Amino acid sequence: ETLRVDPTNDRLSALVEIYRMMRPGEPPTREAAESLFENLFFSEDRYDLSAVGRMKFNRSLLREEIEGSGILSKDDIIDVMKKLIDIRNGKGEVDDIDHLGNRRIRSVGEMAENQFRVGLVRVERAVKERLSLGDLDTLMPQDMINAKPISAAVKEFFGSSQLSQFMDQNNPLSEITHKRRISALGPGGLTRERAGFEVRDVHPTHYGRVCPIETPEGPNIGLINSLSVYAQTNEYGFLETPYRKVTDGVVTDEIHYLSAIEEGNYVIAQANSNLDEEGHFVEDLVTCRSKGESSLFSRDQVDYMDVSTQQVVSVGASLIPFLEHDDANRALMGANMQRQAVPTLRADKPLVGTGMERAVAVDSGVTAVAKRGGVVQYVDASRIVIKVNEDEMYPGEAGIDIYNLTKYTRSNQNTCINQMPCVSLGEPVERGDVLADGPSTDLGELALGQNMRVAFMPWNGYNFEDSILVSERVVQEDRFTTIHIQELACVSRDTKLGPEEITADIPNVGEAALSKLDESGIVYIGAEVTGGDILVGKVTPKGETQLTPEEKLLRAIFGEKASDVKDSSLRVPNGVSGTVIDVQVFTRDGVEKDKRALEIEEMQLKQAKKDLSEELQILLKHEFEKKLEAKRRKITQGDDLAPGVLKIVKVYLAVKRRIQPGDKMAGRHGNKGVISKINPIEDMPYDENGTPVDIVLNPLGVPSRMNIGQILETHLGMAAKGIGDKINAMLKQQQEVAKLREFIQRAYDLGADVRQKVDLSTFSDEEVMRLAENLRKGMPIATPVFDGAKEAEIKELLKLGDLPTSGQIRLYDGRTGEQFERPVTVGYMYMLKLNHLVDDKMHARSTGSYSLVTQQPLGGKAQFGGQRFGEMEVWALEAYGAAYTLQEMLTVKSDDVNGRTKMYKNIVDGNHQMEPGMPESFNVLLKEIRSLGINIELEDE
Amino acid sequence: VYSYTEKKRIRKDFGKRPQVLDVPYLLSIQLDSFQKFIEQDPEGQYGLEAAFRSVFPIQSYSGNSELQYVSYRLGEPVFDVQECQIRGVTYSAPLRVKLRLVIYEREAPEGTVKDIKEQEVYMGEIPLMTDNGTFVINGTERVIVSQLHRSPGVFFDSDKGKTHSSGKVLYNARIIPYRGSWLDFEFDPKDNLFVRIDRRRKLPATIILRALNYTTEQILDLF
Amino acid sequence: GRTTDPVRMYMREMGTVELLTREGEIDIAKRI
């Protein structure tokens, strides 16, 4: 029937028909049509199924050759048509587009290679065109090729592309979870606007390859998936996950990485399956999943078993203790939130973790890890020096390692990156040991927040919907305080009226305002500035001011002169108040350096010599001196700045944000919350011992959203702290080594058969005391994701300490001293400070700058702009009778140019009346419709 | 066995399933990909070598003057990572490619060449990956996120009866390359097979068959 | 078929005239 409807009769007619389809209007011709068809699919230059493409093509056609060619053939096309026909009638299955055996993974190397090849083709075009006229001795292979296209392509990819983004750096976990992030968007993928639900949905093939919960909720949900903990990538780019091979009945320890399409062909046992100490399943019927579904299978039926119970989740999802007790929505929220925790002043530790904190802390290069074992030779806040053990020493070298710690620097999110040593002098360290603690890390453990004594009770509406009541002791201990380094640049350019200057002479500012600036006009280092103070003093030349009358007169009266320079000094933003910790000066090559630039340069040169000289002293002389001349030349070489800009001064401010109502806190279980009140320590609930609770959380938050993990986390949290408290006592009275060893050993055993064994007998008395001192703040506990601590074990640990196993104590009102009825749940919960500080979100405006084409206020808080009173707000005003409110909102407060100045004046003299007028945007619309050939006018003028 | 930094403070461990495979390096996905891109292998499989081999050799149309690629190397970065962050620059390595311009003597189909000009030339600066999977591009640390995209090959994706009344299933095949145009086959409700190229106007499928130098008789012989 | 591309229409209209024959340009200059 296709032939019946087919209009063509010969090959040339078909070629011209497809030519008319491809290039309508262009008359079809023999040679052109032939070339077009031969270039579509059968020319290697303009068509390529990659090796993976050929492999998938040959697999889908049931061929037995995994390799082949990159261009299509007659056989390939005809076989595709034949299989389509077979699917139409025979037994054919629609391919699942969302199958992870059908979706490939592209990484940075591949995409960069593709864009480099794009640059190469667009340089070869020029190379060929130039070669069109071959020469003998006038051209070289340096003039036929231009680097600009290749550089432009590479820079366009790496700088301005959807798949290359600013690195989320407010956390170790945020960095690590950004680096292993999968996105279906970008050039070659879908679009968030028209992706479609089916692609967003979780697939049974995501199991162990793509996390089911770690994904952003919003416009692009299910399109920004994150890689699972154990997931890998094929040579071809398909995600594969590990499994332990099962013989007849023995679970072997050999690991096979199975891809999605291979996963169906076997039945895979669960990680929550038992083994009788020899590899055999205890139960004769085990739960498996064969093809999408799961069922029970005989012991002698399974080919594979899950490598671990953690392998379904991502790294962030696998840091949530008691995840299995949390609703999937709330777990999604919890992972997303803990990606946003701000590093506080002192990283505490998770008192209740999952055991994945060490992996995240070390794998992300936020700490300093020993490259080679040895004995610590010198420790300082800024560096560590290791004397390598001779076993790891290479013959031709000095066995010394110098780790230079990153001191207070700025992250992409304006947080504080700072590395502190975590070792003492003369201590033995082995390869892979943590030597310094980066931001939000405690002895190599990821420490995103603080473990706080929380009580679950209402307390007077101060935690009403999700609000949080916080004690003043929490603020006093500065345990949710953060450092927020920020850059501020003053750039002096070359203007037409004259070059800009960074002098310290600034008109219309008194002696005191310029006290913080040195002679060269730049603030001092360490100076505590306030919102409004000058940082860099700058002045721009100006002329032909065109003074008005009754101002010429005033200047004449006071014998004053109008300055020929206007003030353009860099001032501290209003509200911000920190200390100046760093100043950088970038001077153009030709310009002459100022006093402060020269002073900075000498400090950098001496520092450079000091670092190089110390390196040689600690540890070669030829490389030392050669590097000193290179380092010296780099320090004074002069900076390649933008065109016109004469000199750049960057000032780094260091703020300290403590805590306040409006700051968003969160636990790891999706329990959000904004601090509402900060309470005096004598107003907080307290227990029989007079110890107040740090935070009070509403218990009505828990039941509606089934995140029970937090409650569990609280109980275990209490239990953990309990152990520490006991240890604390045994350390305040110098009891003995034996008693501490016995109690700590008893605390590590705890009943149920746990895979972890700790024998304190091999711990020397000195080591046991160090362990006890590290455990006096609480006993850290690991509760793996789906293999956590059972409730009975929590009760047993609560019993080891003298805490009740119900998890609830009787609390008293600090206000009245009366016992709260109905004992309340108190414990320790890991609270995080999220990067949603009310410092950065409060914003107000009376009048300010206005938009250019439409005479309306501007955007939010960076241009000091106003709030959008959108269309739905207008509807709300209309539904009320508020017609004067609405009119003033859309005429005098926004758009009427003459109206808003009159309103400002009228308010100034206490006459709260307006002359509304016509908004300027309607005038713009009238001129725009008239700018088409449409005559629109106002009647009855 | 307890490492020194873990002997200081041991985390009590619940959980009963023994560990058989430890967590891999968490940043392998980025580091391995960029290593394969930047490192040069003695094969055209991966990276800049693959790109050069795939397109860099060039022949002057009707002139038979050739420009061929020998090897490449990455020059030392001018600045370190920290200096790039401070000044504001892309942590990049220069790309120096060895090229050879071979000139063929006129009327030499055998391959006799006049001369060869072998010179090393500069082809842009490629941004480098720091030790932790990041790129500093203009002094700011950037991350390139891996993309999950439809794999090349043939896919059969009949609609679910959402097109025509009675919910008839119209089957289709689609060839997706890495580079090139798309080639779709589809069915209409009247049970006819139609070819479509780069998602343009529909055509009867047999047209493509005729375009491949097939007659009606052998077409029916095939199908 | 049909197209809206102005460049395609220009190509259509201009390509109709045969390019030239040597000694034809000389005769055209002669006519000028």
Short mmCIF file of C-alpha atoms in Angstrom, two decimals, chain A residues 47-61 69-70 72 76 80 83 95 97 101-104 238, chain B residues 149-157 172-179 181-185:
data_model
loop_
_atom_site.label_atom_id
_atom_site.label_comp_id
_atom_site.label_asym_id
_atom_site.label_seq_id
_atom_site.Cartn_x
_atom_site.Cartn_y
_atom_site.Cartn_z
CA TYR A 47 27.06 11.52 9.89
CA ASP A 48 28.38 9.35 12.70
CA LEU A 49 26.86 6.76 14.95
CA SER A 50 29.55 6.60 17.62
CA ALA A 51 30.94 3.22 18.67
CA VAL A 52 28.25 3.17 21.36
CA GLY A 53 25.71 4.10 18.70
CA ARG A 54 26.78 1.22 16.47
CA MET A 55 26.75 -1.16 19.44
CA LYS A 56 23.21 -0.17 20.44
CA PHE A 57 22.05 -0.26 16.81
CA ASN A 58 23.40 -3.78 16.35
CA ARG A 59 21.96 -4.92 19.68
CA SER A 60 18.51 -3.60 18.79
CA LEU A 61 18.62 -5.51 15.48
CA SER A 69 30.94 1.59 10.92
CA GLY A 70 29.73 5.07 11.78
CA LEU A 72 24.35 4.06 7.70
CA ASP A 76 20.93 -0.94 8.24
CA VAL A 80 15.26 -1.03 10.69
CA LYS A 83 12.03 -4.69 12.50
CA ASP A 95 11.58 0.50 23.58
CA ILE A 97 12.92 5.65 26.45
CA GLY A 101 20.01 0.93 29.33
CA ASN A 102 18.82 3.43 26.73
CA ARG A 103 20.05 6.65 28.39
CA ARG A 104 23.80 7.27 28.24
CA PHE A 238 25.77 3.52 30.71
CA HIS B 149 21.03 11.91 27.21
CA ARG B 150 19.32 9.55 24.80
CA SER B 151 21.86 7.08 23.51
CA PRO B 152 22.47 6.77 19.76
CA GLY B 153 20.84 3.82 18.04
CA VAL B 154 17.40 2.68 16.89
CA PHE B 155 14.37 3.12 19.13
CA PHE B 156 10.80 1.94 18.52
CA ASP B 157 8.42 4.27 20.34
CA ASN B 172 7.55 4.15 14.64
CA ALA B 173 11.31 3.67 14.48
CA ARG B 174 13.92 6.37 14.97
CA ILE B 175 17.64 6.31 14.21
CA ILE B 176 19.58 8.73 16.42
CA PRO B 177 23.26 9.35 15.60
CA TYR B 178 25.92 11.09 17.62
CA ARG B 179 26.40 13.48 14.68
CA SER B 181 20.42 13.95 10.82
CA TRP B 182 17.60 11.90 12.29
CA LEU B 183 15.84 9.20 10.27
CA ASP B 184 12.30 8.32 11.36
CA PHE B 185 9.83 5.76 10.05
#
